[PDB]
Automatic annotation (TrEMBL), chain C:
Similarity field: Belongs to the RNA polymerase beta chain family.
Domain of life: Bacteria
Protein name: DNA-directed RNA polymerase subunit beta
Regions annotated as coiled coil: none
Function: DNA-dependent RNA polymerase catalyzes the transcription of DNA into RNA using the four ribonucleoside triphosphates as substrates.
Residues of the full protein shown: 831 to 879 of 1269
Species for this entry: Flagellimonas taeanensis
Binding partners and assembly: The RNAP catalytic core consists of 2 alpha, 1 beta, 1 beta' and 1 omega subunit. When a sigma factor is associated with the core the holoenzyme is formed, which can initiate transcription.
Length: 87, 365, 49, 346
RNA sequence: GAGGGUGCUUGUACACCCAUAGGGUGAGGUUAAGAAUUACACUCACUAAGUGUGAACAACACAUACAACUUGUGGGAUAUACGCU
């Protein structure tokens, strides 16, 4: 049983990292885009400002700015997918 | 002006430029002595920078005294008779002078005293043990010691002195990679930092911290590269319609585990090997697997990070995002296989430094 | 629940009307099959459409 | 001429012998505060002891040896922390620094410090009424005015036996330690046990068998030991055979005319050394077999034929083959009475 | 045939060799035995490796392909093999 379990860990624990990726929850990111996230996304994509510059301008931490930008990208991707499905 | 450079380190092999064997052996023995003195030094400095803080704590428990590390000539509450780094440098030089150079002492002193102040937080509460430096340590030498750097065309090697000893540098078949790097210093064009030196059983290596600059490409911040890292596919990257999968489960995890299994095989087989001549000869075969799988993992990680950076630059992806990396760190933490078979901190740090070099801004989430 | 199409559905070509599972033909459980099921799992459960 | 008494360390679980949850909570808090005080005391004692020992290298400041530091730490932590543990700690650090002061001064080893999770020490005087309790099934005692009962859990190991000999006085106890790892209080007890003179007792049976990947297997009571492993025995054999093949290939393609002996002495010796390899192998295998026989006081050892027919066998050839390969049987017979154990037949 | 030496460092493979190198030994301490002698996962250490020139175990010259080349130091933690119960 131990040998079988080691073979199991060798096979499936290498696929368990990607199993969560394939089983990612389909979070309904259909809510209105927050002002801070929208400003961060506009600065990074349109104004072409570095995230350090965004943090300096908005008086926010670099990690928080990065999290807000990733959230903004996530809900914009969800909205774009919804628009493509409806068009 | 901001730091327009990212620190970088290179390994340069050096042979001793002497005609006869005995002079080379004398120099090599002197340098081994330098290693031993450097390690004993590091121990002396760390002990001497531990004790005084606990004397401070003793006085504070005595009468709540506000004793602080400062020269008494410049502070009423100061106890030190000079600067702290000077105290450690003195208490090591008074004993080890005349055998090994003092620039090693200065570099080691700075390198430890800078870190210990940051570790003060962990040391007042107590979650960290005092360092016990090894014996095979690469000993440090400052830039104030490199001298007589030239290119001797007759011997086809750069010549220099590491504190009054000639040294012919062995680039070998490296006429491009680091070749125009030492010449970039003989003509005063590249900046060098406090370097180190290693010796691994006959060969001599110089770990030179050359300060290299960033590379500017044609990158678009709006274009985003979606990177994910898993143990089945080490890197999977999206860029619009372009997909790249770097690494295979067989070439990273399976070979790593094969090296581990071979090491266990030799460990098992060493019990009944030649006996009665000591533990060292029994574990001789184990000694072969010193940094085998670490080297393999480092090389594959370098290759994978280079391919990721190349793909991101070639598609002008000015912002690289690691998807769900926090959750994967969380699951890896509460596991055993994932932590001890999937180097994600090494991959993350290689990606971070190789993307901060190319201007790509890296995001984790 | 009984694998039977609902009243009001549109029977486009190729849709399942009454789903059914028939016990598949397990031969003698050779050791190789036993190990493969032990480690991978019973993905190929003994049921044919 | 080693010490006749061996030192062992066991980690048991200890719970506070107070009926209500509240009292257990204050006692756990008191244990944690004791550990904190012990940490601070150990740090200060080691620091000032190194300070006093290294006075001539301590000129960068502005301005027995036991008693001073012990007195300061005692007046620092009196009442809140019973002084017996403090004195035991102080003696322990002064003994350890005496042990490795030579490498202290040379700088080969740094100053060993302490952390927030170091098991604080305590001697015998702390523990009182070291007896056994059967009604509640816990070896009970009283440490520093606090009764203490152990939650040994499902402990089927030798911890129960060791505790049973300890309470009866059959085993002496040394300066032990208490740890508070993850809430569950643990006791690291160091026992000084007199090495009983092991003698031949011809009433136990030792079971020796040949195997397929686990060579000689020996079973006695609740104990088992294997002498080697299959790939271990086969590694040198494979290396020797392959090297013999390539040496033969090189010799057949080498320069001839200098004598057939000069051409094939290595070829013959490479096959010859295999015999010495297997002879030394049987030697060390029988040596370990006899070592178990003597170690576990076994008086009778018997080697199964264990041959069967068809089944699983008759296809695999057995590592070490039958019980006569290279006079294996003989090499355990002549060795047997060499030590005294009775290896008869099976 | 693994594993290695030289071919700057790492990985793969590659030419030339070494390779019973998971071996051949030396010394010190200790143990057991009447002795020979054995023993130690006790300690320390030595010994093999391209071609040519070269008296030479001196020195020097020459010696394959692709990819990568930011490391070093320390702490916390886990596991593997071995030894004891």
């Amino acid at each position: 049983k131990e040998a079988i379990e080691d073979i199991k860990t060798i096979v499936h624990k290498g696929n368990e990292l990607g199993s969560n990726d394939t089983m990612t929850n389909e979070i309904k990111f259909s809510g209105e885009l927050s002002e801070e996230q929208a400003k961060v996304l506009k600065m990074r994509c349109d104004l072409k400002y570095s995230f350090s510059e965004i943090a300096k301008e908005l008086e926010l931490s670099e990690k928080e700015v990065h999290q807000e930008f990733m959230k903004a990208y996530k809900l914009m991707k969800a909205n774009h997918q919804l628009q493509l499905q409806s068009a | 002006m901001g730091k327009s450079t990212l620190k970088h380190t290179r390994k340069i092999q050096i042979l001793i430029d002497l005609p006869t064997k005995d002079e080379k052996k004398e120099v090599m023995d002197m340098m081994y002595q330098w290693r031993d003195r450097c390690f004993r030094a590091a121990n002396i400095i760390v002990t001497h920078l531990y004790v005084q803080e606990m004397i401070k704590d003793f006085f504070y428990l005595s009468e709540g005294i506000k004793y602080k590390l400062a020269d008494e000539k410049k502070d009423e509450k100061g106890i030190l008779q000079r600067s702290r780094m000077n105290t450690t440098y003195r208490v090591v030089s008074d004993r080890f002078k005349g055998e090994m150079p003092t620039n090693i002492l200065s570099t080691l002193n700075h390198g430890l005293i800078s870190s210990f102040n940051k570790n003060r937080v962990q040391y007042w509460k107590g979650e960290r043990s005092l360092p016990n430096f090894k014996k095979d340590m690469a000993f440090p030498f400052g830039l104030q010691g490199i001298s007589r750097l030239v290119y001797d065309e007759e011997k086809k090697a750069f010549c220099f002195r590491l504190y009054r000893v000639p040294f012919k540098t062995y680039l070998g078949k490296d006429f491009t990679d680091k070749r125009m790097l030492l010449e970039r210093l003989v003509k005063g064009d590249v900046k060098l930092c406090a370097s180190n030196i290693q010796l691994n059983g006959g060969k001599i290596f110089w770990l030179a911290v050359f300060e290299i600059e960033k590379e500017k490409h044609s990158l678009k911040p709006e274009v985003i590269a979606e990177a994910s890292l898993s143990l089945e596919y080490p890197i999977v990257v999206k860029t619009g319609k372009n997909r790249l999968t770097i690494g295979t489960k067989e070439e990273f995890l399976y070979r790593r585990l094969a090296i581990q299994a071979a090491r266990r095989r030799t460990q098992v087989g060493a019990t009944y090997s030649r006996s009665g001549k000591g533990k060292k000869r029994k574990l001789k075969a184990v000694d072969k697997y010193h940094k085998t799988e670490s080297n393999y993992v480092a090389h594959r990680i370098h290759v994978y990070s280079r391919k990721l950076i190349d793909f991101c630059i070639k598609h002008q992806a000015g912002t690289l995002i690691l998807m769900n990396q926090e959750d994967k760190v969380g699951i890896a933490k509460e596991e055993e296989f994932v932590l001890r078979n999937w180097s994600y901190y090494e991959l993350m740090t290689k990606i971070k430094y190789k993307a901060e070099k190319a201007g790509i801004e890296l995001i984790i989430g | 629940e009984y694998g039977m199409i609902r009243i009001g559905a549109e029977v486009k070509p190729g849709d399942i009307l009454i789903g059914k599972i028939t016990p598949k033909g397990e031969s003698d459980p050779t050791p190789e099959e036993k190990l493969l099921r032990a480690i991978f799992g019973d993905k190929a459960g003994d049921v044919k459409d």
